[PDB]
Structure formats: C-alpha cells, structure tokens
Symmetry: C3
Amino acid sequence: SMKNISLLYTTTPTYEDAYRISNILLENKLIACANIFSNITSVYVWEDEIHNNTECAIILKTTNDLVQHATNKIQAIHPYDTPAIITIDPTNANDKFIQWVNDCTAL
Amino acid sequence: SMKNISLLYTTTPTYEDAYRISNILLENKLIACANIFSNITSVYVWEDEIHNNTECAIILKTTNDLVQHATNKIQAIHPYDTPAIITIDPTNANDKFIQWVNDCTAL
Amino acid sequence: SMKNISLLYTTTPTYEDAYRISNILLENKLIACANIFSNITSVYVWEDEIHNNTECAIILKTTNDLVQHATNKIQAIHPYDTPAIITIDPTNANDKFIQWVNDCTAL
Ligand SMILES: [Ca+2]
Ligand SMILES: [Ca+2]
Ligand SMILES: [Ca+2]
Ligand SMILES: [Ca+2]
Ligand SMILES: [Ca+2]
C-alpha cells in the first residue's frame, strides 16, 4: 500500500476496444481495474462542422509510478490516432483499496 | 459557502446498493447529492484470471471537511469488503453551487 | 499544445440540454469536445425528503485559460438556477491530445 493511486480516462469508438485495452493493461499489470461506461455521446468540431458519435469511456485505476507506462501503452494500442488519455490524481482513497491497487500491479 | 467542495467516487454491484448508500449519506447530511451511473462494466483480475461484472458508479458531492467522515461511513455500509472509495478535489466550482453544497451538509 | 487542458463537469435535466450546451460552447470555441453520459440518476434532498430525477452528465475538455469564460457561458445558458459547474485539472495528458484541444479552441 506504499504508492498513491492514479486515474486514467480515455474513450474508444466501441465497447470491444475498451474491453481489449483494459485486458491488455491488466495482463501487463499496468492497472488494477477498469470502469467502462457505454453509450456516451461525444460532440466536437471537425471541418468547421459539429459532429458526434457514440463512444465508450474508461476510468482506469493504477498507481502513480505506472501512469506514464500505462499512457504509453494505451497510445500504442489505441484505435484513434489522437486519443484522449488523461491522468487525474485523486487526493485520497480508503487504505484497503490503496493496498489492493498496489498488490494487483506489483510485479 | 465557507468550505471548498470534494467529489467522492465509488462503485456498487447493483443500482439498489448505490441508491441506498446515496440515501444513507444524504440523511446523515454527509453529502449534498449523488450522481448514479448504471450499467458500467468493471474489469479486473481475480485468482489469476480476468473477470468482469456489471456495476453502478457514483459521484458524491460534499465539502472537504466531511470527506474522511463520508469515506468511513461508505466503508462501513458498503456491500464490498474492499470498495473503491476515491476522493477528487476539484480546483474550482461556481459560487452558487459551493454555497448550496455547504448549506445542504452543514449542521 | 502550449496550454494545459482542464475538465469541466456539469449535469442537465435532459439530453437535449446537454447537447445544446455542448453545441453553444463548441461554436464559441470555448471547449474542444464534450462527453455526454445519459440517463444518470441524481439524488438529493428537497422539502426535507430524499428525491431523485433523471439527468445527463457532461465532461467538457478545454484549455485552462478558457475555463473561466467557459464557466461564465455555462451559467448564462444553463436550464438550472443552481447548476453544478465543476473544474478538474488533470495532472497529465498525451501531447497529441493537448495539441488538439489547443488547436480546436484557438479562434
Ligand atoms: Ca490472451
Ligand atoms: Ca429511514
Ligand atoms: Ca480533503
Ligand atoms: Ca446556430
Ligand atoms: Ca484553471
């Protein structure tokens, strides 16, 4: 339970992409868990017009020493050329959870 | 509007569990509101295999002096032995809302 | 990619409201994108009892120098008298996304 936790946020065009990324990250012990939110609507401007499509969001939980590697890995395997890969540092968590996230991700 | 706000994030196995936690915290004036997200998929490893199940996520809003009390309370009533109870301190919010969160949770 | 990105979080009574706000912010180049989460349940106290209604949540992505302007604009156009408009500052993001958020919001 030594290391502080970090959150990673990213979006994917499909659920399968979100599941695949979560899987690859878990298998590499780069995260402890992922929360996948389905059917989010993403709205943005492309070519001076407002576009939207359906996506999944993911919250990834890991420790702060693994954040850069996890980001690099997501970037390497992401279906998007320009994905949102965003790091949020929580101010606190319950000790039992901090412990578990560390244990899951320790080599 | 004296105190700065904090967000708490947690997940539950069912919607009913999330409503219940939301409810109990509200009646104790430990939070001002809850946002419940349904049908999220959580992915993690157990016994060396990758598992997933469906959960609800919750964002809980309160003031910073109540975070520890609210976390302790969530731990005591949570269905999971090891729940994720995570605190994020926003850098800013609009005054009318900070005021409201304060008025809802102040003894 | 000069300026750091910031996140805004808010909720709306309907999806149409969330889409409308996203739209207005985009046409003013005050955000780079919106992620809209539908059919969330919001729980709070009204009239000394615990109430709930349906909402959408939105995560808005922009640059830090636009946060105040984006918040002011949201307050002016929001259907709620007391909206939650919350700023979260990520600790890190991938360069390509920072670059894009900056390019999208430049006049
Ligand atoms: Ca395999
Ligand atoms: Ca009762
Ligand atoms: Ca605090
Ligand atoms: Ca127009
Ligand atoms: Ca700022």
